[PDB]
Write a protein that holds these residues in place. Sequence first.
Motif, PDB file in Angstrom:
ATOM      1  N   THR A 139      36.424  45.409  43.452  1.00  0.00           N
ATOM      2  CA  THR A 139      35.543  46.128  44.366  1.00  0.00           C
ATOM      3  C   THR A 139      35.989  47.611  44.473  1.00  0.00           C
ATOM      4  O   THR A 139      35.149  48.550  44.427  1.00  0.00           O
ATOM      5  N   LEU A 270      30.955  45.846  38.498  1.00  0.00           N
ATOM      6  CA  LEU A 270      30.527  44.863  39.499  1.00  0.00           C
ATOM      7  C   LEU A 270      30.241  43.504  38.846  1.00  0.00           C
ATOM      8  O   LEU A 270      30.447  42.447  39.441  1.00  0.00           O
ATOM      9  N   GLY A 271      29.754  43.551  37.622  1.00  0.00           N
ATOM     10  CA  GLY A 271      29.590  42.363  36.797  1.00  0.00           C
ATOM     11  C   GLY A 271      30.901  41.770  36.338  1.00  0.00           C
ATOM     12  O   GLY A 271      31.103  40.548  36.407  1.00  0.00           O
ATOM     13  N   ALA A 273      33.540  41.981  37.904  1.00  0.00           N
ATOM     14  CA  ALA A 273      34.133  41.415  39.094  1.00  0.00           C
ATOM     15  C   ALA A 273      33.728  39.976  39.340  1.00  0.00           C
ATOM     16  O   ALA A 273      34.283  39.324  40.202  1.00  0.00           O
ATOM     17  N   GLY A 274      32.719  39.491  38.636  1.00  0.00           N
ATOM     18  CA  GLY A 274      32.283  38.095  38.791  1.00  0.00           C
ATOM     19  C   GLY A 274      33.290  37.115  38.249  1.00  0.00           C
ATOM     20  O   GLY A 274      33.774  37.324  37.149  1.00  0.00           O
ATOM     21  N   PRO A 275      33.566  36.011  38.965  1.00  0.00           N
ATOM     22  CA  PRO A 275      34.519  35.028  38.414  1.00  0.00           C
ATOM     23  C   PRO A 275      34.141  34.461  37.054  1.00  0.00           C
ATOM     24  O   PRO A 275      35.044  34.105  36.299  1.00  0.00           O
ATOM     25  N   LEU A 276      32.859  34.390  36.701  1.00  0.00           N
ATOM     26  CA  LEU A 276      32.509  33.872  35.375  1.00  0.00           C
ATOM     27  C   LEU A 276      32.618  34.891  34.254  1.00  0.00           C
ATOM     28  O   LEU A 276      32.390  34.541  33.101  1.00  0.00           O
ATOM     29  N   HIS A 277      32.972  36.137  34.554  1.00  0.00           N
ATOM     30  CA  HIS A 277      33.136  37.167  33.505  1.00  0.00           C
ATOM     31  C   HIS A 277      34.609  37.635  33.370  1.00  0.00           C
ATOM     32  O   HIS A 277      35.127  37.745  32.237  1.00  0.00           O
TER      33      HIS A 277
ATOM     34  N   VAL B 253      24.146  40.685  37.797  1.00  0.00           N
ATOM     35  CA  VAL B 253      25.500  40.728  38.362  1.00  0.00           C
ATOM     36  C   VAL B 253      25.786  39.461  39.184  1.00  0.00           C
ATOM     37  O   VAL B 253      26.867  38.869  39.121  1.00  0.00           O
ATOM     38  N   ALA B 256      27.009  36.234  37.272  1.00  0.00           N
ATOM     39  CA  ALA B 256      28.445  36.053  37.044  1.00  0.00           C
ATOM     40  C   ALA B 256      29.183  35.508  38.283  1.00  0.00           C
ATOM     41  O   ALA B 256      30.398  35.394  38.267  1.00  0.00           O
ATOM     42  N   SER B 258      29.334  37.089  41.164  1.00  0.00           N
ATOM     43  CA  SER B 258      29.588  38.142  42.122  1.00  0.00           C
ATOM     44  C   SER B 258      28.694  37.899  43.354  1.00  0.00           C
ATOM     45  O   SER B 258      27.548  37.447  43.241  1.00  0.00           O
TER      46      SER B 258
END
Lengths: 437, 436
Positions: A139, A270-271, A273-277, B253, B256, B258
């Motif tokens: 973040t 921000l993408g 930051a996603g747990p799946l990435h 976004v 994923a 987020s």
Amino acid sequence: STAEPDLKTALKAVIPAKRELFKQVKERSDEVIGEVKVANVIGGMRGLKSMLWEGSVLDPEEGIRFHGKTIKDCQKELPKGTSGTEMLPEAMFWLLLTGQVPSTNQVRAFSRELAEQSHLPQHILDLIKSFPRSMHPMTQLSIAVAALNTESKFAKAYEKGLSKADYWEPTFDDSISLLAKIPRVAALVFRPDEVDQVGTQALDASQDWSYNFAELLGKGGKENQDFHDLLRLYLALHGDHEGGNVSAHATHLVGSALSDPFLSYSAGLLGLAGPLHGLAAQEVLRWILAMQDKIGTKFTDDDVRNYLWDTLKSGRVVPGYGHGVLRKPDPRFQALMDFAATRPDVLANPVFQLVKKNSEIAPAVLTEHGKTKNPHPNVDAASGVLFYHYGFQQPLYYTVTFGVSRALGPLVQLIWDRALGLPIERPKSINLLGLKK
Amino acid sequence: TAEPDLKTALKAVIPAKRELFKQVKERSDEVIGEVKVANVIGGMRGLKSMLWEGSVLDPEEGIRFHGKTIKDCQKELPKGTSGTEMLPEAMFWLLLTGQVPSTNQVRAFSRELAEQSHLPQHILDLIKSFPRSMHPMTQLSIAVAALNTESKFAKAYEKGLSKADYWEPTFDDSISLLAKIPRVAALVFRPDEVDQVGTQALDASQDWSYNFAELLGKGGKENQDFHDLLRLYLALHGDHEGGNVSAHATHLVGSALSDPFLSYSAGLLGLAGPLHGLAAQEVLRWILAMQDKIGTKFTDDDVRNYLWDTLKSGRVVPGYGHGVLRKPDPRFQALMDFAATRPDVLANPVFQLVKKNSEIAPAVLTEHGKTKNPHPNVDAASGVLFYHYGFQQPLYYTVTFGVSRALGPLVQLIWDRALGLPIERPKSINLLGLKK
């Protein structure tokens, strides 16, 4: 001076050929290349060949290639630092952008440009100091990168009136500016108590981007030169990997509305930051350390085999293994193993020995078990352990380092998007009722 | 016998939607179109390739929400305690549940929105760090991302949370963001008054738009027409399919995993782009330049002539034209309907210019022949109406758009998580690979 062409000039020289190629492709506009099924709509566009990405293409036999060059080709051909064995991310950036391998001299000059542009405006430091200690690192990184849009030449030039044919140039300037600044931003995220000092510390303008990043992280000097090589390699390897991953795609998507590169790569982050990435390297590290806890530092091949079978029979996966398309080990993984092979302290580390052993045993076990397609190691199998070996033992921050690397490829494509005049990305939606009919 | 709250109403319709999804999934293998080279190089235009539940564009009647036209929504959706216009809160209810709420249900939802509007101290400190000259949409995007410190989804996911319950903290974060974003927007509008505007209590018996107007310094009975305009505007711009950049980026976004704060921040970064968020400003500038040339008293012929001159000179008429919509945008007509009952608006020459243009430009553009479906869109009227009510800094019109455009994408993000939709991941290709 005795000067070879700079990066901007080298890019300008290859633009006309690419615009010509684009024009030729556009003549085949009506040609059919695939079908759209219900599965593609409900399944996040998986399999649907629907976007452009120039710099990197995944080869099912050789893995990811950059303008047709394998990872092995890049390690051989790309310039290195003033000391060290590994390819420089700045050289990889040059390749991705121009299609060409730069001379050592061209890279030295580019590194100097990056070092000169690495300072931050005061408001960015003030912004970072406002963050609570517990604000997630990704973040922090995303926000600070967006905040740098105050420095955007593209935003200002577009507002003033700028011709379509020149969009690429301020886009390029902002991309270099972001690249130069992002390591410092990342270091401020890593070192929240030291923003005033780390935020203004002068950098040696004769050193490379990775070296200077390492310095800002508190790991500069000749005694950390192996880490410098690891970091160069890591940043170069993770720079680009086609357009479909969320960080690359989101950067392209937001950029396609003519948001500048600071805003666009912030969306990328921000993408990430996603747990799946962004968490694969962390997951592998945890899994390796838990395996070490159970089987010790002195184990047999059978012990490893047994541990893998137990994991699989319990319904759990081996992270860092498996690909939909790639039929061999990820060449980015092998490059990390090649790095390790010349360093005896790494080879002596039992945690690294465990990564290596697993890579020699797990594929046959996973194949026999039969549930995981192409069960070969990927780059995430080794990256975490190598950072850990060099004293980077807060895995939460490994996505931050990934964010620094992953600026490279998407910024390149954003420059090409603007050079070519690619339009706004605008797919068509439909509701479930409309698919039922 | 108290009427169900929004969360309960959502829970009641989830099973039916999961059943529908399951049925669609059985037809997974069905072919529904082709991909051409044109789709790859042309930003996927026309390529039906993503899911969006709440809104579908009808080529004749314009955008429909669960089958309802704009006109249906104006008739059926509850209104404020005073005023003639539909409430954005009611539109949100419809988008999310597929159902029209009672007035009573909306009143209770509005109260919830007012009560959840406060911001943590660090958000105020963060906003005060911004230079005065930082672009308003950069400010808004950043502040919304910073609110991820308050994310229930992020924390619950980290702790371990079952797939089947992803939707619930997603819903809680969405309501929280909706409640806070007007206040964040007002802090962007009023940078000298962060301490006061940032902590001011909201009247929990008033609606979301009214309270937004109050935080902007336009509260009270003297501004009641503006309140109606703002309600209408926020409701009309809430959702318009999945393909626009702000909706799509939020979905992307979000896919994923987020949370909604991070996801809608990406949406806002997209709305900050000149090709997505500036249309209303461009129209206003064009209208004022037209007024400058032809004066405050002009004839139909003057307007016709000005349009011809513009086109023959190689310039475009902004706010007109669409790839598929064969009539005036019903969102445009709703703004004109609002104007029709207010004589001070009808007397404004700038509004008269919007109206005249709407009656003359289509035939002129058609005759000129360069513009497909040359009918007015919502952007033809929105700027001028804000301007009429004294909201005359066009730079901030995208901020108001940002507040509205939280509605639809957050709804879809909740459904994405309810259904278990996966990460969005197309496949890329290089130009050399298309050329072979």
